[PDB]
Structure formats: C-alpha cells, structure tokens
C-alpha cells in the first residue's frame, strides 16, 4: 500500500494555494523559489542549443537558469560548484536540467483525489510570493478554497510525459466531465454576483468605462459596439458589453417560470449569435449547469475556446464590480417593524396549535395513524406545525426584503446562500433535532433542570423561536448546541467511512477498460458489458434531449408528423416547398410518407415501452436542436420562401444518414445486429426531429441547410463514441465515490445504505415490499 | 413557585475558549465550535516572562490590542491584559476579487 | 506592548499622545472618549490605537536584568 | 521570501524603457503604449484627458495584473492624426492644468493667516 | 402514490393508485397473494429479487437501489457508471460484493488481489497454489514499475521503414 | 494554556453527542472536529 | 496472430490516446535528434514539430492495436482519421 | 499571570489530562439485544475506594 | 484666474480644508494618490545597534525609529543614496542620528524622539530634525528603561517615498468628497424606509444647492468641485503636501513627454 | 439607408416593476386601430407619463465601429428626442394579415403589433428606434 | 480569522492609494468577502463590528457579552448619534479612479487574530534528494527535504486519465527505479552479474 501502490516522489512541490482573477483558467501561479528548485531535463539539440547555453550561463540562482548539465559520459555537472560552470560548452545529446518555466505543462493536485479532475495539467506561470495561484473557476473540480489549503505539483521529465499531460489531462479538456455529462467548472462568487448586477435592464454604462471594459477583453475585435441608447447621451447596457465575451455562433434559449418572448421579469435566457437578447445572467446560465453557456461553448466552439471565455467573462465582470462595489451588513438581516410583528404572531398562533394538540393528547381524544404509537403520531404533528411555522416566518421576511438586500442579491444570483439562511438570520432559527427526534429528556422526564417534568412544549423540546439577529436564550443556545454537535459528529465520521467506500469501488473496478472491439473487459478478458454503457458512447459527449414522439395526444402527434399528399387539407402547402403543387396526389411518393409515418408510430409505441412514465428528456449524443439552430443562422433561413427539398431528399436522406451512424464495425450478423441495437434510441430521436412535416413547416430548411445538418449529425455522432483505451472502470468507481463523499416511509438511506448495498449485506436495516 | 435554585449567570455554561466569542448567542452553533479551536492557534503575549525563558518556539505579537467588543467573562480570563489579536479596520466588500 | 508610533490605518503619529492621554485620565479624571478627542484623535482608526492599547512593557520592566 | 523588492514598483529594470509603443493590428490608426514602473496614478489621468480630445476615437488603460507596476494604454485617433501626438497633447494639457492648480493654491494659501 | 399513465385521448395523465408499504420481506409468499400485481411487486432487498426473479432482475433491482442512494442526496451520476458497478457485481452469476470476500476472491492476478486488504494471506495461498500472474492488471505493472496496459499503453507503436523511406 | 488545563479525555452508547447532563459542567462548543470530536470535553 | 489489412474492423479514426502517444513519441524522437519529415517553418519545440508532422501525415509510425484475444490490427498514422 | 497546574519534568512543562471513566459501585440495568438468551442484565462495577 | 481653482476653508500646521473646482475627478484623485504615495521624505533606514539591555527586540525598536517623523523641508536638496556616488551613504545623501540612553533613575527612564542627536553635517539644510508636535516637547516615545538598561544605537536616515515604505508617507488621512446631494446618481442609497432620513447629510451640503424634486435627472451633469482635507504628519508643512503633490504629478507627466522625445530619435 | 415605420401612438400605461431607471410602456396608434406597442424605455433619460402622444419611427440607417463627437458638423439624423439601436429577434404571425415584430435594444425589449409593414420590417441587427414629443 | 470561525489567508496586499476609502479619509486594514456571511450565518461578526465602531467613537468598552439586553437597534441608535449611518454602512470611493462606489460598504473595526499557519513555514519543493536506506525511495517530510507522496488515489486518477507513460515515470524515473539481472531458467534474482 505504501511503497509500491503509492510512494513519495521527486519533482514534487507543495504550498498554500490562493486565488487569482488575472490568471487564465488553465494556468498555475508558481512561486519563483519553487520554479528555481523544480527542473526539466532538456536534450541539447540544434533548436535549443543557444537558449539552453544561456540558462546554463544564468545558473542556479537567476530565475530562467539551470541546475545541472548531463554529459553523454553519464556524469552530472553541478552548476552550483563546478569550476567550469562558466566555460561550459554544450554538445548535442547532452541534457540541461533547467528550471521550470512559463508554459511548461505540470500536474496540479488537491488531495484527497477522488476524481480524475482532482489532478489536472496546468500551464506554468512563474510569479512572486510563496503561494500557488489558481483561476477561481477551477476551484470546484479540486474542491479547494483559500482558508489554508495546500496543493501538490508534479513536473513531467520526458517529452512523452509532457504530451500525456497537455494532450489528455489539461484543464480545458476537463471542463465537460463524464461524471454527470455536464460542465464541472462554472462562474463563481464575485464574478457570479457581479454578472447578475451587470445584466439587469436598469444597468447602463457610460462611454469612459465601456472603453476600459472593452480593452479588458484580450481578444476584442477593436470594434466599439453601437450604444443601445444613442442620444440623449450615448449609453450601453450590461447585457450589451458582456456579449463581447460571448463568441459568435453561440446560440442559447431558456424559458424560466413566466418567460414569454417579451421576458417581462427579465426571466430565462436568449443568446443569438453570441449576443444576449434578454434575461439576466446568473447560476442557470453561466454556472456549471447542464444547459449552460459553458456546456454549449465547450461543445460548440472547443475546450480551448471555452477556457478563454472563463477568463473573458471574469476580466469584464470583476472589473465592472471593482468599480460598482458590493457589500453585506447587519442591515441586510434586519426585517420591517410590521414584518417582525407579523412573524411574532405567526409563531404565536403555531404555539397555540401545538398546545391544542397537546391538550387533545392529554385528554386521550387523539387517534393514532395506522402503524404508529399515539405518542409517535403526536410528536409528528408538533414537529410538522413548528416547521410549517419556521418556514412561514422565513417566507415573510424573504418577501419583505427589497431587491437592494445584499443577501437577497447573493441568493438571487446563486453566488451564496439560500432561503433557509435568510429565514434563520432574519425571522426564526427553528426546531432543533438530534437522531431525528426533538431534544429528549436527558434528565428524568425533562430536557433541562430549568423545566418542570413531562414538558412537551416547543420551548422545552428545542424550538429556537428567535432569529440569529435577535439572539438565543440560554436554553435555545444549549439545544442548538446539541443539534449542532450532531452534524460535526457525522462530518467527522462520514470522512473515513466515505473514504474506504471509494477505495473498494476503485479496487473492484481498476482493471476494467474499453477494448478495440468496443467490449468492456477486465484483466481476464471476461466481458463485463458487451458495449460501453449499453450505447457505446463517451459520457462527456452526451446531453439531455427531448424525444418529441413519446408524449402528447395521439391527435397532436398526427398534426405534427402526418403528411397526406392524397388529401387537399393534409398535403404540404406549396408555400412549404417548390414541388408543393406537383406533389398532390402522388401515389408513389405517398408510399414513402406512409413508411415515414408508420415508422414514427412504431417508434412512439417502442419509446413508451422503454420509458414507462412517458419521460421525454433523456441524455443522448448529438444535440440535434442546436444543429438546426446553427443551420438557420449559418444559412440565413428565410421563414417565408419555399424549400428546394424533395420528399425523397428528406425521407431517403435520413434513411441513409442512419446507416452511417457507426458504433460497431464487424461484417457479420452478430456484430451487425449489435450495431443496429446500440443505435436504436438515437435513431428514434433522429427520425422524430427529421420527419418531413417537421423539416419543412417548423425548421423551414433549404436543401443545402439540410445536407449540412445531416453531415454534422454524422460527424458529431462519430466523435461521440468511446475511445478504446478508456479506463471506464476507475472512471465509474470515482464517478460514484466522489458524490458519496458529499453525503449528509422512513428507510435507511445515504452513506450507510450505500454501505449496505456494496457489502451485499444479508441482514439489512429497513427491509420493505412495495405491493402494487 | 417551586424554584429551589437560581443560575449565577447562564454564560458560565461556556469554557475558557468560548468565553472570548463576542455575541455567541448570535452565531450558528458550529461557527462557535470553530472559534473554540482557532483562538488556541492565535498569536499574542502568552506570559510576560517570555524574554527569560528558553522554549522551542515562541510567537509574540508586536502590538497586541484589547478587543473593542468584550465579554464580561474575559475579566477572569486575563484576556484584556494578555490579548490574541488586534482591532482591524474591516471592510466587507467585493474589490479586486482577490 | 509600548504605544504604537503612527496609527496603522492612516499613519497619524500617536507615539507622543500616550502619556498625555493617561494623564487626562488620572489627573483630569476625564472619560476615555473626551481625552482621545481632546488629543485630536478624531477618526476611529486613530481612536482604536490608544483606546485599545495594552502597554505590556510596564510589566516587562518589573523583571531585574 | 518570494517577495519582490519594494523599489521594483518605481525603479526601472535593467534595460527596460518607461514607454514601449506597439501598433494595434486589429484597428487602423491605433496604438498600444506599455508604461513600465507606473500605476493608476498616471493611467486613469492620461486616459481621462485623451477622452477630452475630440480627434481621439478610442482610449483605455488596464493594469493586467497587480503584482507588476505597468499598464497598457490603447489610443485610436481619426485618420491623419497621430496617436503619439494625441498622447503628447493630453500630457501637455495635464501639466498646464496642474501648473494653474499650483499657482491658484499658492495665491489662496498666502491669503490665509493660520 | 401518483402514477403517470396514457389516457384514451393519448396524453399522459396523473391517475394515482393505492400502494402498500411493508415493514419486512417475504417475496415468494406475498407474490402469490390474490388482488396484487405480481408483475409490479418490488422490494428494496435486491438479495431477495435475485433469489426469486433471477440474476437479471437482481441487476435491475441492484441498479434501482444504487441510483436511489445518489438521487436521494439530489445528485446526478450518469447511468453507465452505476450500470458498470451493477454489472461487475452481477457477471459471476450472483451477488459478488465490493469487499475482501467478493471481488478480491476472484481469478484475477495475485498481486492485484494483494493490493487490497488481504496482502500476506493472499501471497501465501498464491505460493502453495503455485499461481501464475499474467500481469494484465494495472496493479501488477505498477508494482513492477512498467508501463501499464491502460489508454496510452493499450496499443503498441512501430516505425515502418517502407513509409519512412517514402517521406524524404 | 488555560483551555489545556481544563481538557478532558474519554477513551474508547453515543458518547460524542452533547448530553443534557453536560449543562453548566462542560462547554457545549469547545470540542475538536474529526476523530476526537465529542470525546474531548472542556470544563 | 495479426489480422489482414482487408479484414481490419477497429475504428478508422485515431483514438485520443493514440494521438497523444504518437505526438509524445515523435516529440521525444525529434528531441533526441531524430530526422524530421517536414519543413520546420521556423519551429523549435519538438511537440510543435510533432503536431506539424501529424498535420501533414508525414509521421512514419504504425499503431499495433491489440485485441483481448492477443491478435492485432496494424494501422498507419497516414491512414488514421484525425477528427480530435 | 502564570496559573500553575503543571509539573516540570526534565525542563518541559507537563499537564495531567483528566481521564473520564464510568463511576463504580453503581447498579445499572440494560436490555440485552434481540438475538440473546438473556433479555436484561443488572450490572455492578464493584471496586474499593 | 485660469484653469482649475482652489478656495481654502481652514488652515493650521496640521490641516488644509479646501474646495477644488473646474477639475476632472481623475485629476483630483491622481493628486490625492500622489500626496499619499509619491512625495519624498527623510526617514531612518539603517539602525546599527551597539547595545540594547531593553525588554524590546533590536528590530522591534529599529522598526519604530523608521516611523519617527524627521524634518524633510529641504528634502529636495538631498540625493537618493541609490543615485549618489559614494559607497553606501554620505552627507550628500544621508542624515546620521545617534541615540544613547541609560536608566540612571530608580524610576522608569523614558527614551524619546527628542533624545535623537544629529551627528552628520547638515550642509545647513532643514533636514533630519525629529518632528516634535508634543506639548511637553518630547516627541515620540521610543522606549522605556529601568536601571542598568542601556540603549546605544546609530541611525542612517535616507530620502524615500511611501511606495517603498509607508514610513516615507508625509500625509495622514486625506479627506475627499464630491456631490454631497447625490445629483450625479454615482451611488444607489441602501435604505429600509427613506434614504434621505436614513443617511446623514454631508457638511458640504451647505456649499451646494439641494436638487429640488420637481426637476428631471441631469445626465449631461459632470463631476467638478471636490471638498478635500489634507492632514500632515510633520515632515513637510500642510501646504507643501498639496504643492509638492501637484509638482510630483506634474514631473511624473513630464517624464512621459520626455520619454516620447527620446524615442523620436530613432 | 431609409425609414421603415412611422406613426404617432398614445401611451395607455407606464410600468417600473422593481426597475428604478427603466419602464415598459403600453401604447396604441392614433391612426390605425389594429396597431399596438409594448416598449422598455430609459425613463431617467427621457421621461414618459400616460396619455402622451409620441412619434415612433424605425429606419435601417442614420455597420462598422462607432465614433463619438464630430456629430456637431455631422448630420444628426435625429429630429427626435430619444434614440435607440437594437436587433430584431422574432417574427410572430398573430393571425389574419396581422404581424408582430420583437426588438431588443441591448435588453430593452419592444413588441410592435400591426399588419401593413410586410414591405418594410426585416430580421436585421440594423434597426434604430426614434421617439419625439 | 475573526472570533466567529471566519478564517482565511491573505490573497494580496494593496497600498493605501489602491484601497477604497471613506470621504472622511479612513481606509480598511482588511477586505473580507460578502460571500462569507450568508451560508455561514455568523451574525455576531456583523454585530461585533457595529458595536466596535460605536466603542471606538464613544471610547467606552463595547459589551459583546452573550445573554444581554443589547440589541442591534440599540447600537444602531448610538452610531447615528455619532454621525454615521446607523447600520454601519459608509459610502466609499474607489481607490483607482476616486469615483464613488454604487454600493455602500459595511465598514468598521473587527478584532482579527493572527494564526500559527504562515506560508513560508509551509512552502516546499524537491527534485532529487535524500533517499531512505531500506526502500531506496524519497525520504519523508519538508523537514528532511522529502519528496511528496504520489499515493494510491493519485495512481487511480492517472489510470482514469489513461496517462500510462506519465504514471510509469512517477513510479520509476521520478522515484524507486532499479535494474536487476534475472535468470531465464528459474526467474529469480540469483544472477551474479560481474558486469565489468
Ligand atoms: Mg478549505
Ligand atoms: Zn488613523
Ligand atoms: Zn552619498
Ligand atoms: Zn536460475
């Protein structure tokens, strides 16, 4: 375990980490001293000879210098002591052990390391001061903060090793992760908080600041965008100047509760050609979200482009907020005089409701719920009223706090804090629990010696009536302390239990990987999965997509999909395509639209068999929605003029594309039937999104637009398949292990249940049948 | 009407470290548990005889300050006589993002 | 220990004001807030310097060598 | 320990000019002046004065990172006008403005009896 | 419980049902009870599902269970990961646990098994059984300090003198 | 120094939890995080 | 046993791992003063040289792709599609 | 200000830490768990002062 | 008179209250920055300790000696040692101070900035005199000694700026305000009921016209008129903090004009 | 290079729901009954109250970067009091001969409902919004 | 850290001119992030400050004792008596431009502690150094100029990445690596290599 499976190593370095808004996503600030110690052995070659000779001349003390010279002979020259450290004349093939320099690839790691993202390749940036500086958005994968965290640095020694780092594990590559098929890095804290503030309708920027904000973008075209307001006084909006960081071609649409194309509340999101049309940018848009601006950018433009976008969004936002400022005070916890009366009187009425159930229980009139003690039933009610109360009291304050409330502002952007935090701070802390139940009678028939015996009152069993702003009574203080201690105990324990779970998952899966036959096998060549994850696709290349066909009324489906060239009402109007007039009554063509519709109906039944509930949204490769969107801007699709497509062009075009969606290659029934199988689901989606009526009426695609959409689905699909060599074993273990690490009818669940599951525990804790 | 005893002062339920926490009745339970662990690692004058003793490691604060916000319990803890910090002018703000 | 020359926050010399402050309290019986203000210490950064000082040096002097 | 010398903030490095004027590629009649051993004190002052010049189309400055005392100033002027000349005039205007400010303070101070 | 079901008109509509919740397990018996859906009946005890409904159902229940533990915490792990774990425990023909007993007692390499938990008791047995480690596991090549047969090392690289002489 | 001379060790039902009986006798906040949490009492 | 070129069934596309290893290997060889099969258009970094050689498919290397049974399919870097 | 309460052994200060034990000579009744022949036990940890 | 104008409100040895009208906020600020950071001063920079029997550390004391304000009136006729031609220091570039103190008294013996003595030749220039603002005429209290407590040391004071060390900071706090009625809408006032009732009215409100609600927002409006207060530490007189500040910024700009001039040669 | 829409509307309502410097305005054309208008305006810059008669103009011109002054000598294509520049984002077919066009002036939204201007309005980044009275 | 479990390291140090400032000429010694406060619910930190601000002006000891009749309203009233805005906010001006901040900053004194963890006693780097005798592997700890541990969990990440050669290097070249001569008949390290 300790000298072979893990060992300490040379070319390693460790120090306190600190954040930096001025580092690029993929770089790492390396202290001069650390750079002056760590070395790379470079071979003397015609290409570097002169440079290398200079670093040798520079020596071990100057920054871009060197420590040793390795002759062909094998003996090491110490530049620190060699009498010939000056007059050292290099020879091709020798090695110069030179200092670590700006842009060298290095492995950066934050322990524990329950993730492949816990060890990523960064670009060196030699800097002053004794800390490792990292870009803030890269904080999340490592799980780092700057409260006193230290991080590890490993230096590759070979051209091969360096390539491995730069080509497989570099930070930009790691953005979209296979753990949850979504981005694992997003915009955080200052930049998240500032991004909401910047993008409100209210927010307008004067020329002076616009110029600085523009210049701050390192790839800015040099083009001053036309102000949204030209006289009286030229003024730009936040939305406008943020859109300069958003690259061209980037298309995004999101509807939040109550979003119209007129977005009255500045709800949801609409980014067209990498320009914001409406809505406020926050967590859902610019965070590590599934539908994310980041998810689309990585996928559409590249990992290197997306990594640049992080830096860009932050350089603008942070600069703006530096000058706008943002604070948080006690005034932000303070709630209205009447809101406080209204809160007090909310607790007051709940306090009586509880006494009423208590008086009812003492008079033996209470009637227990089937499968519960008369007492169990009572405590349930009490606990339920008191919580209903804490929340009401909370929701009262939350509403009374204006949009100027700095806390509300942080909660609104999603930068920090939630509802409960406002509630507990402003209004009421609430009921305290230990082992699920209220504070119990540690003393004979009472919680504390300040109480009378057989006191089931909220005040006796741990209900903290007061806000943190108001302060806690000694009794409230001690009960909160009991309840508080419980969490610290599990935080403490879980830590090692969770650790060992991770180990066992890893050790059981380690030897599993995808072979060149798309088969998932172990060190015995025993097949685990015939095809990776039953679909033969890489998880990073997958996105939640809606299978339209699945739901809706049988009539609504019909309207959407049916083409009947033999009926004057259900034909494609000659406005839809050029052949419209000559297409009516074509029996031969109708045979093809019958196949089309008949397949779509087949598919509907099938999908309804797979997803029994009728759930439409599933993670599948190739975002077809986006390809269409792009075809539309790429080809400047005129939603007026008729298409130059044939029914044969659409119908057969799709039929043909399908045969080109290759996962398995072998020439034989077994492997060919296998290929058909893997591709099934994706095709149902493909056929749903590319049916004739849809393509013409909805998408309004031209032949070239369509031809392009088809080629792109193909290309994307192919890129989407898993790579033989993928160590899917470890991946899967860590993809379950890492989340288990973040874990806090009544059935045994979470960490102790996962423990039960993995152990194939014979005598389980909550056995239960669910009888339908 | 049954009261046999009275509490001298409820703040006395707290130990040496928690007794330096200002308004601990206004903090979330563990934040208090954290401070009563950190203050043990806070620099200051540990004893006035520091200059006459040979100990492995000694950390002494140049200009210690008594706290502006204090506990009645600190009187007994000798804290204002031998402090662990300085009263800093603190802005809670978003600035350069550093 | 031993009065800071200059307030940390703004750097107004505060080194001279110590004995003078301690005097305005014993000899003049004056409350801390007036003495500070008499001495022209108006900004709270400057006020905190004197008001919150602990002159440990005086104990240190109590040891012989 | 990894702390840079304090004079590095103001004292020019070995073979390091105060100004380095490089031309902007992305835009016509635009330039980029890097000011070594300088901060906001001068940057924001110059930028604001170039803004007063009518023949100046674009002007902005940025301190790319706080560990280093240097700033990049980008100047774009109308065709025919030179950005170096634009910078020269704004520099001059500033001096002449400060010259009056001193004269005016001096006169007003001499009038006081305290 | 609320159940989404297709309506005559086609659209999926909420058609809630009465469901029973047990405090104990007896699969064999409760299944044969008149008035229930023996096609729908579920137990959290997948060990039972395995015993009564076969290993295939054992896999489906085992995944269902794993999935719940993650989603209960409000977390999302892509199917494939849980699927793989579930499959590995399955393949043998029963419920092979992620313990020193289960997986670590399979036909894999001896040094591999020894790197987790039983070390010396595994190497003695390895000796008296005259085991032969084919060194295909990642563990072995790590102990041996050789390039593991994983990703980058899953294939070999050769120079071709044909193509070499072609480019010049 | 003070808090070290008031420290309590408990070697080896639910010991880590803050008991009602700990009122006025032991500090409800002063306890370590991790392994020794709630097994190291402070008077 | 070695699968004939006419019976090869692995991807016609180069894997991430293959490409990373080819680039690593060439860069290593280039760095050990091996002959460069491309015009270095001022290039000096062996990885940027490697990238250039792979960009023009002037890398004289072959990927021996092993199958779980022990057999293999040999693929030239010239013939592998680089969609990465 | 030094408060005493430690020893000086070979020049380093040492603090005895209070050790917490269960009081002796104490009668305690406990239910012995579901799989057990014995349902309840009365224990007394008897020891001399 | 000409361009930007001053209107002094109050004066003393230690403070200058004034109004700066017909100026760019950028200019007002750049001056404010310079006054804090770039005006040269003389301050102790090397401390050679011969004897120290005190309760305080050699460097603890050393640190304080730098923070002791020294007469920097004629600072302009002293050279920065870096620019000077000697080996370390000399008269042309430094002021040598001496401090010998001893506990003769049974009572506590005090060490003051007055106890500093100049040993270097001053070239008859107003420099290196420990600034004494103290009523009793003692200046800064450096140390306290008991009986056999001796303190014998030597100080080398050098020309410097606040950028290198805050000891060469000639100014204390610089007060700076504009638009006491938020006419410019440069701040969005945080409030609970009324921002007018909740936020205290500035002193300077009296020196400006209240906005009068029955008027539209002046967007065209720009920031001119700055209410400032410059506080001196001693080294330089209050007026000269302002003047030298104006001059430093002027010189700083001239360097740029000159740099461009040398660049024109090639 | 020329005008695309011209009409005088009358404001029915002005709405600053939480917004301190901006307002959604509801107006209808005094000429055509079929014509209505929804629009976000910087009311801190150009104030608007209800029953105000306002000339609302479109026009595709009067491309590349933006220049600030010289406009003193340049022909200020504004005989109007408040001017905006935005993008056309949607073309809603609201039955019959009725159409509705959506305009975003950097977040400041606009919805114009009518019929006639089939031969005018287009899906262009270029669209100015001019308002007088 | 403050006395509220509100710990942190210095990210940067700014001079007085770069710092944001009150019109009164006051500047912070410390800038802490608003993002600390909400999730943490350390209300007493905010109160400590407000009370400390009053205390500093009033020259009276601010009683921050637990169970008392001191209210945030009480202290607020006292601060308004001193000329400051009751909830501790103060309008600040940006240090670089001098332009007023659109936000008003919660500003006042707070007792901060200096903790035993300083970067320079932590920072460590190695690249070939002392080795153990038995295992012939890098020695342990910063103290001994040891190398860091590329442990089991790190091996896993490398295996996940598919960094076959990067791993081999860490385990061999970068640590342990040795050469033996073995026999072809009995695969043992028996060989008497007199390689010379
Ligand atoms: Mg941390
Ligand atoms: Zn001060
Ligand atoms: Zn000299
Ligand atoms: Zn042999």
Swiss-Prot record, chain A:
This protein's UniProt keywords: DNA-binding, DNA-directed RNA polymerase, Isopeptide bond, Magnesium, Metal-binding, Nucleotidyltransferase, Nucleus, Phosphoprotein, Repeat, Transcription, Transferase, Ubl conjugation, Zinc
Misc. comment: Mutagenesis experiments demonstrate that the minimum viable CTD contains eight consensus Y-S-P-T-S-P-[A-S-N-G] heptapeptide repeats. Identical and simultaneous substitutions in a number of consecutive repeats are lethal: 'Ser-2' -> 'Ala-2' (14 repeats), 'Ser-5' -> 'Ala-5' (15 repeats), '2-Ser-Pro-Thr-Ser-5'-> '2-Ala-Pro-Thr-Ala-5' (10 repeats), 'Ser-2'-> 'Glu-2' (15 repeats), 'Ser-5' -> 'Glu-5' (12 repeats), '2-Ser-Pro-3' -> '2-Pro-Ser-3' (15 repeats) and 'Tyr-1' -> 'Phe-1' (12 repeats).
Protein name: DNA-directed RNA polymerase II subunit RPB1
Segment of the intact protein contained: 337 to 1119 of 1733
Record carries keyword Transferase: yes
Major localization class: nucleus
Assigned GO CC terms: cytoplasmic stress granule; mitochondrion; nucleus; RNA polymerase II, core complex
This protein's domain notes: The C-terminal domain (CTD) serves as a platform for assembly of factors that regulate transcription initiation, elongation, termination and mRNA processing.
Native source species: Saccharomyces cerevisiae (strain ATCC 204508 / S288c) (Baker's yeast)
This protein's record includes keyword 4Fe-4S: no
One GO BP: translesion synthesis
Subcellular compartments: Nucleus
GO MF terms, alphabetically ordered: DNA binding; DNA-directed RNA polymerase activity; metal ion binding
Residues given in the record as Mg(2+) 2 binding sites: 145, 147
UniProt similarity note: Belongs to the RNA polymerase beta' chain family.
Binding site for Mg(2+) 1: 145, 147, 149
Cross-link (Glycyl lysine isopeptide (Lys-Gly) (interchain with G-Cter in ubiquitin)): 359
Region (Bridging helix): 474-486
Swiss-Prot record, chain B:
Signal peptide (UniProt feature, chain positions): none
Superkingdom as given in the UniProt entry: Eukaryota
Localisation: Nucleus
Remaining remarks: The binding of ribonucleoside triphosphate to the RNA polymerase II transcribing complex probably involves a two-step mechanism. The initial binding seems to occur at the entry (E) site and involves a magnesium ion coordinated by three conserved aspartate residues of the two largest RNA Pol II subunits.
Family the UniProt entry places it in: Belongs to the RNA polymerase beta chain family.
Function: DNA-dependent RNA polymerase catalyzes the transcription of DNA into RNA using the four ribonucleoside triphosphates as substrates. Second largest component of RNA polymerases II which synthesizes mRNA precursors and many functional non-coding RNAs. Proposed to contribute to the polymerase catalytic activity and forms the polymerase active center together with the largest subunit. Pol II is the central component of the basal RNA polymerase II transcription machinery.
Assembly and interaction partners: Component of the RNA polymerase II (Pol II) complex consisting of 12 subunits.
Name by which UniProt lists this protein: DNA-directed RNA polymerase II subunit RPB2
Organism expressing this protein natively: Saccharomyces cerevisiae (strain ATCC 204508 / S288c) (Baker's yeast)
Gene: RPB2
Portion held of the full protein: 736 to 833 of 1224
Swiss-Prot record, chain G:
Residues of the full protein shown: 72 to 155 of 155
Compartments where found: Cytoplasm; Nucleus
Name the record gives this protein: DNA-directed RNA polymerases I, II, and III subunit RPABC2
Other facts: Present with 6090 molecules/cell in log phase SD medium.
GO molecular function, one term: DNA binding
Cited function: DNA-dependent RNA polymerases catalyze the transcription of DNA into RNA using the four ribonucleoside triphosphates as substrates. Common component of RNA polymerases I, II and III which synthesize ribosomal RNA precursors, mRNA precursors and many functional non-coding RNAs, and small RNAs, such as 5S rRNA and tRNAs, respectively. Pol II is the central component of the basal RNA polymerase II transcription machinery. RNA polymerases are composed of mobile elements that move relative to each other.
Coiled coil: none
Family: Belongs to the archaeal Rpo6/eukaryotic RPB6 RNA polymerase subunit family.
Quaternary structure and interacting proteins, as annotated: Component of the RNA polymerase I (Pol I), RNA polymerase II (Pol II) and RNA polymerase III (Pol III) complexes. Component of the RNA polymerase I (Pol I) complex consisting of 14 subunits: RPA135, RPA190, RPC40, RPA14, RPB5, RPO26, RPA43, RPB8, RPA12, RPB10, RPC19, RPC10, RPA49 and RPA34. The complex is composed of a horseshoe-shaped core containing ten subunits (RPA135, RPA190, RPB5, RPO26, RPB8, RPB10, RPC10, RPA12, RPC19 and RPC40) where RPA135 and RPA190 form the DNA-binding cleft.
GO cellular component, one term: nucleus
Region (Leucine-zipper): 40-61
UniProt entry tagged with the keyword Nucleus: yes
From Swiss-Prot, chain K:
Name the UniProt record assigns to this protein: DNA-directed RNA polymerase II subunit RPB2
Quaternary context: Component of the RNA polymerase II (Pol II) complex consisting of 12 subunits.
Gene (UniProt): RPB2
Localization in the cell: Nucleus
Zinc finger (C4-type): 183-196
Taxonomy, superkingdom: Eukaryota
Other notes: The binding of ribonucleoside triphosphate to the RNA polymerase II transcribing complex probably involves a two-step mechanism. The initial binding seems to occur at the entry (E) site and involves a magnesium ion coordinated by three conserved aspartate residues of the two largest RNA Pol II subunits. Present with 18700 molecules/cell in log phase SD medium.
Annotated family: Belongs to the RNA polymerase beta chain family.
Job description of the protein: DNA-dependent RNA polymerase catalyzes the transcription of DNA into RNA using the four ribonucleoside triphosphates as substrates. Second largest component of RNA polymerases II which synthesizes mRNA precursors and many functional non-coding RNAs. Proposed to contribute to the polymerase catalytic activity and forms the polymerase active center together with the largest subunit. Pol II is the central component of the basal RNA polymerase II transcription machinery.
Binding site for Zn(2+): 183, 186
